[PDB]
Amino acid sequence: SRIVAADTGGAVLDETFEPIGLIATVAVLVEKPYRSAKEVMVKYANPYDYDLTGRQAIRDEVLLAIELARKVKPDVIHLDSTLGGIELRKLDEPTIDALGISDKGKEVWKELSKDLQPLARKFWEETNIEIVAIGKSSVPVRIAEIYAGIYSAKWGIENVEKEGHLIIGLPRYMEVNIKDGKIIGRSLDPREGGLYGSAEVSVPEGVKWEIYPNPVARRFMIFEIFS
Amino acid sequence: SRIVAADTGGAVLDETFEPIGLIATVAVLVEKPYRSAKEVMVKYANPYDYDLTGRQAIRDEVLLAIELARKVKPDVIHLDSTLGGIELRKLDEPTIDALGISDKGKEVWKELSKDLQPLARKFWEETNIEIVAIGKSSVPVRIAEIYAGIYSAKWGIENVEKEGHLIIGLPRYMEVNIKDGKIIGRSLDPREGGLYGSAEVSVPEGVKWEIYPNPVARRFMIFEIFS
Amino acid sequence: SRIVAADTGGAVLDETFEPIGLIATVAVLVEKPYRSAKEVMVKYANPYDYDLTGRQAIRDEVLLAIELARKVKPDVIHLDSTLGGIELRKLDEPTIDALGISDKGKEVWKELSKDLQPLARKFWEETNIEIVAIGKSSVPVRIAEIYAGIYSAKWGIENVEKEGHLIIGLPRYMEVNIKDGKIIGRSLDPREGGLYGSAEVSVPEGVKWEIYPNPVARRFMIFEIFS
């Protein structure tokens, strides 16, 4: 089985540790043994002027996953939305209103559905690839979240000159390490079976970074970067 | 304190990673320091022709635990069913109907109790050993579930000739390793405090096995076997 | 950012593993990189003649945190109560009756707030330090809980002559190790990012200790001490 999955992302934080905007969306291709990505694509947002309210995030994920799936032709796309295991193709207002999710969730999806559902139908019609809202039980979605963290740290090493100082909130329970030109990212949860990832990075001279727990977000780490 | 507990089991999966049937039921005797089994007994089911619907599994566990408990005479049996520590002896329809579980749960139990309650009562009358429905908080229940994974793996090594290829779904967050005739099973969650188990196995010539994350069940591993 | 937090505690258990009373209340000063305490203060309860019913524990916590905060002057105090991060200062009956917690939770807090709310208000008026009911998401609160575990162990090494035998239930998923006059305590959960802490201990001649899983409370350890 060969799976494409997408996720956003790390976050730029305040001094207060409050998030101001998300950084990276990543789409990944995952095959046996399902511990890492075979292939990756990335799209960076503007974490300043990002609306944390609403889901520009899921819109970008679907879009990016479709793009990579056209290239790599997986059997299926996994979407990070825990809706059962349902096909995005079939998410019209009626089937949404029959879902076992909160009323607030239903409203959010009806707005999303207006364009995402025709998009998934068209994509399916010409590729036969389903987009399944499986969410939390998907290992590829988790791998994509690790990569979103990895490329958020990359976006931080790279953008720390423009900005003077960067506080980046990493996705849940993951660590990032930089040695000799590459960034390696890992789940901190051994229960997930050794999920990891990698990317190349060019470290400007004299930039330092530390990784440590976010005191106000337990189980999340901070990646802090100085110039 | 000396405790007996039982649990089923590992699963045979198809190519879609959907379970077709459970494999091993194991009862274990656990004593200080409560990290492993002092003694074990095993009953294999037929994973093909197995009804995943319903609960032949809990019926087999009670039956196996009772068998082992007559032999080793523990102080108590832990049953993998989270009701609030209640003795199976006293689970008649009226007490069930006042339990704090879902209505669907109450119906399963009423059916189950029809024969399991006289059984637990009879067994207690002659042994004074209770069967407590404690479930999730029980370490010996978790240790039993690791052994069920270990013996599902053993079942896999030894049944991999008849069947040409075998995909086994392990119980949550546990790994299996085979060295030199023994399968070692271990929890992957360090929070549980180093739970582990062991069994002997004779690995047929030229069979290979891999272990990797179940892509569609996060935090569950696959034990894959070839002939 | 510099944070004070408090928590109770470890527990003395009978032979059934049922708790009879809480042992240590600890306040800690936590700063970057938020993995440990910069400074600690402790207050032991009498675990015999302790009322597990109600919350003398949260009262002693606020009291102890305030005491340490007067000394080290952090920006904020984290309180171990998951109320949404509301300031203890403002917890009167009306705002409590509008919180999204259970009705049982509202009543406990109404009783608590009768003295805790004037207390927080007085303290704020002369210090400008808030006490925030942030709870579960707070790393400093989890670090205080590791320290309460560590000092419960200390309390056990030093009270094991008076009482012949001591069984101590450590806080959730944490281990304790003693080498050369030092107790080191660690979270067992790697997802937390390496939280740890330390205390000095004088181990009386010929006392023994063991750490192992509590069979009836999964993910909680026992610290068992002999004289």
What report would you give on this structure?
It is classed as unknown function. Keywords: B-factorsharpening, homodimer of trimers. The structure is a homotrimer of 227-residue chains. In chain A, β10 and β11 (196-200) form a beta hairpin. Helix content of chain A is 29%, strand content 30%. Chain A is globular. Chain A has 227 residues and is α+β, with helices and mostly antiparallel strands. Chain A starts with a strand and ends with a strand. Chain A has one domain (1-227): Nucleotidyltransferase, domain 5, CATH 3.30.420. Chain A has helices at residues 56-72, 93-97, 103-125, 139-159; strands at residues 3-8, 11-13, 19-22, 24-30, 39-44, 76-79, 130-133, 165-169, 174-179, 182-187, 196-200, 208-213, 221-226. The B-C interface holds B 1, 3, 30, 32-35, 134, 136-140, 142, 190-195 and C 15, 17, 172-173, 175, 188-190, 210, 212-219, 221.
